[PDB]
């Protein structure tokens, strides 16, 4: 899948 | 699915 | 899983 | 998320 | 994450 | 997270 969100 | 949010 | 985001 | 306060 | 605020 | 703001 696709890279997750900014921390 | 998305990654995980990062740090 | 995609990978982490970004700090 | 966004980091801490600074000192 | 962004940097934190400003201590 | 991200890192420490500034003083």
């Known amino acids: 899948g ?3 969100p900014p921390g």
Chains 1, 5 share one sequence.
Request: hydrophobic share 0%; no cysteine.
């Open 2 to 4: 696709p890279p997750g």
